[PDB]
Amino acid sequence: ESHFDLELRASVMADLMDMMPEGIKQSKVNTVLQHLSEAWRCWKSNIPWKVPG
Amino acid sequence: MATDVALETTMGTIILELYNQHAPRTCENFKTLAARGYYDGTIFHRVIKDFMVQGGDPTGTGRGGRSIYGDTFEDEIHPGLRHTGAGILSMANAGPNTNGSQFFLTLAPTPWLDGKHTIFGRVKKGIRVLQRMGLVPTDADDRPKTEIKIIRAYVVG
Amino acid sequence: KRMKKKEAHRDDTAFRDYAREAEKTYKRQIRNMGAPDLEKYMREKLSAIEKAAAAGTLDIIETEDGEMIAVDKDGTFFSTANATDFAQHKPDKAAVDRLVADLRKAEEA
Amino acid sequence: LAALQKRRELKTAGINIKITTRKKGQMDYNADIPFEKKPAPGFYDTTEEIARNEWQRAHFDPKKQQVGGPSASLQ
Amino acid sequence: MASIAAGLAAALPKPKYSSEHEEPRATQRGPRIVSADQIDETPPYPNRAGWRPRAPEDFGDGGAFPEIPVAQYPWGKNDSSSKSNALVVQVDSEGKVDYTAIARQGHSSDRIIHASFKDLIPLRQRAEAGQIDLSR
Amino acid sequence: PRPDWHPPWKLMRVISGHLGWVRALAVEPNNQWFASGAGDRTIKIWDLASGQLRLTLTGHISTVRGLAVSPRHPYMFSCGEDKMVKCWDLETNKVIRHYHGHLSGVYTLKLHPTLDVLVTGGRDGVARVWDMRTRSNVHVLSGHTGTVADLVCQEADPQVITGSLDSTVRMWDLAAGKTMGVLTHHKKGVRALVTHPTEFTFATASTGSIKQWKCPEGAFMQNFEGHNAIINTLAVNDQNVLFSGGDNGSMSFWDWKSGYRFQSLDTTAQPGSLDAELGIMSSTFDMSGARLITGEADKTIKIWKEDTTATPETHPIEWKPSLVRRKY
Amino acid sequence: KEYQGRKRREFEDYIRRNRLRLQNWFQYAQWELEQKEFARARSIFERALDVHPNNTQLWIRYIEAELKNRNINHARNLLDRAVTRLPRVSKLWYKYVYVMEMLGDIPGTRQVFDRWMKWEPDEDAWNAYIKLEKRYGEYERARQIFA
């Protein structure tokens, strides 16, 4: 489970770096990994996950 | 008695003033080789900074060079001509009386070759072309890594 | 022209990319130096003219009108690109002080 | 701070000793520039600047570098 | 093929206000420094005895005189080089000052290093090539 | 350069059955079956003509990311995100060798065309050159600062080319294990590489950008313009059809010589999929070039074939010798 | 030296924990500059450049440390290195032309601009070089730049 989490986080981050347009300021991307964790907890609790904006 | 010889190289055009009054056989050897085209597409196989640019070898190695009087001819050490400064044309030789086709040319005053090299001209135009040819990068055996060749040599009179 | 310039600055306040920020910063820094000393520029130009004439890279010629025309034999009068001696312009102490005080002012702000 | 006070008192009253806290498994960053990467040489000469920088390092002075309405209704 | 440009130049009448005597609308603080393009647009051997040059002016376009028994410097004396740590300024194939030395500093000679705009132009549009051999 | 004509491609078959994203594809050298590797930890063997499931092999504990079937040996090689590289004996259907040593998940595996050599690339930033027999790790190709996302092996120098999520491509001298050259032209992570089968060129894909390069010196040839997506895959024919497959589900078919895009389309997601699950994750042609196999994030394998009824006058080439300045 | 060794140890402990944090590198180099250890600050900047080779902010910090402490030749070597490393980052090109115009080398400014134009930059750089020649009165040179 710890290894699956490491691999999953690396994959989501690589996708986000390659998705971001050139020239956007790109410090907060670990922010997106926090959104990923919260969405997973929302799925486990069957709570709809919808971040405004 | 001066004769122009134009060496169009890859770094500019050298105009050479040949001294027919002082070293006539060597000068007319240079004229005939340039006029036949023996120097066309021929590289400067040795460049040593603050010393020398040598060329004229058709094999590009430094052992070749075929003159017009057979293989070699004699040295003409006229005692009024010295290697007094940059841009002075002389004949490169293995030893005494072994002048062939390769031309030495001083980039700096080199007055230790008097008595063993035959001055037979100078540059009349193109001294900055010669300076930058001296500023090219080379290897351990002084051959230019960046390639310098006389594209075409001809005569003006 | 003034009011269109002011409106352009107002529209260009918000961040777009670092190329725009670099262009804005350079234009503001040029304005903050202000008008160049064309007298000092021309003194340096004439000193370079006589020095390059002595060094043989400038030909002083006279045409059919009898006027001083300088000819750069190379192209290295105006730019130190293609100049083999580009690495020996030791700048003036006043120039170094002015650049350092510029950077100190930026730090303070 | 207490150890500094005791060392200063010893140095004032004569005996000078090297209190060395150097552990097992720690580099001496004072002793040497760690993992030193020199600036690459370029087309500009930097020997005079290097000499001046070494002079400033030798003559550095830590003491010289030490020190560095409206009303409530309107609000 | 320039039909619209030719039609514009044909349809335009001659200017009724003469402009052949017009100087530039803002004068240049001379002297004019121009090149051999504007040159194009606008002692001999062997009696140099007694002649003794002083400057690259006197050398002209350079070349020491072997018959004068004084050391000559057609482009200036070298004083020394007091062990600077600078890179030696070099030139490229056609004599220009080269900054790929900075790009290549600290690599071997046969490392492929792209450092110029020319490495960003598609090969089939690079003027130096005409037929590329794409064979395994 | 005027494009040659190529027919459009159309979806021929959809194969369901993996329980995860289809991330690896390999075709066996006699064109009868192909292996698929997926996020359900599994390797499936499918009959190519019928698209039919012959076998399921388990033996990875994470997603299978790389598959190769050897042309000289009865072996299939699998690499996965559980850090493991395995040789499977196909005469016994069993794992018989490990090539252990990647510090994290292994993204890409290729076999050498002429030597008994495997090359893998992974999240630990290196390509590892393995001797197949002894399981020996004879080179660690080091120098990338990101994940080695893709990799190709050639039969002449540069024998290894690696493309990395640090946005950089490296050509490698395999005898000495050193970089011959670094290509820094891509702005985003290089996820796909492919070599041409009959001419000595390759293509690299990052986000929105396909670059073609001449070997051995890595000279830039052309850009395949217009596929504005994260490209996960590149595939190339011997009839000069290049396929680019994009993470949002978008597909492009290009003429390889001229760079002209003769087809654009999107894939379709299997029922039950989110619209976020449209995406091409793996691709190969079959051994003949007549079938495109794609593995997709809707957990499918899709087989694509050329339209036989298409004609150069039914589907004309809409290419004019353009005349603008591509500001390179 | 005791205090300096303590500070150096804490700085390099944070670099070992997180080398990817520019602020770790930046605060270490700024502290050595404050101690007037220019060789040490240079070494920190170069190790930071080994970790972040293509970072514009880091290149600017290093160049500005040299310029602030009047190491003009060090700084110009850094400027050549930086515009070699990142030839499509117009910030580094603008900093280099601005620095040469502050130093009063107008031929040097023209040299940097000529190298930039070889890289074929955007319209703002062509405009800036036209405006340089108009500033100093060379309208024919600005005419050539429009060509």
GROMACS .gro file of C-alpha atoms in nm, chain D residues 7-47:
model
   41
  326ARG     CA    1   3.589   2.978   2.743
  327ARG     CA    2   3.617   3.358   2.738
  328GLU     CA    3   3.705   3.358   3.108
  329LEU     CA    4   3.976   3.096   3.052
  330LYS     CA    5   4.118   3.286   2.753
  331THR     CA    6   4.121   3.605   2.960
  332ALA     CA    7   4.289   3.424   3.250
  333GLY     CA    8   4.559   3.277   3.036
  334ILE     CA    9   4.500   2.916   2.937
  335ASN     CA   10   4.385   2.875   2.577
  336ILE     CA   11   4.244   2.532   2.479
  337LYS     CA   12   4.052   2.404   2.171
  338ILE     CA   13   3.700   2.299   2.288
  339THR     CA   14   3.621   2.077   1.990
  340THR     CA   15   3.259   1.960   1.954
  341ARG     CA   16   3.349   1.765   1.636
  342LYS     CA   17   3.144   1.445   1.652
  343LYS     CA   18   3.177   1.105   1.483
  344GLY     CA   19   3.038   1.135   1.132
  345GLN     CA   20   3.038   1.511   1.069
  346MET     CA   21   3.238   1.719   0.822
  347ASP     CA   22   3.446   2.023   0.909
  348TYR     CA   23   3.279   2.294   0.704
  349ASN     CA   24   3.511   2.552   0.859
  350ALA     CA   25   3.815   2.348   0.763
  351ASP     CA   26   3.741   2.330   0.397
  352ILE     CA   27   3.499   2.461   0.135
  353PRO     CA   28   3.260   2.164   0.113
  354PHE     CA   29   3.213   1.994  -0.226
  355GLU     CA   30   3.380   2.291  -0.386
  356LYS     CA   31   3.256   2.389  -0.729
  357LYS     CA   32   3.459   2.670  -0.878
  358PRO     CA   33   3.300   2.907  -1.131
  359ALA     CA   34   3.373   2.810  -1.488
  360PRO     CA   35   3.637   3.025  -1.659
  361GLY     CA   36   3.499   3.252  -1.926
  362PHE     CA   37   3.634   3.503  -2.175
  363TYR     CA   38   3.691   3.761  -1.900
  364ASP     CA   39   3.984   3.749  -1.661
  365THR     CA   40   3.894   3.725  -1.293
  366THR     CA   41   4.237   3.706  -1.125
   0.00000   0.00000   0.00000
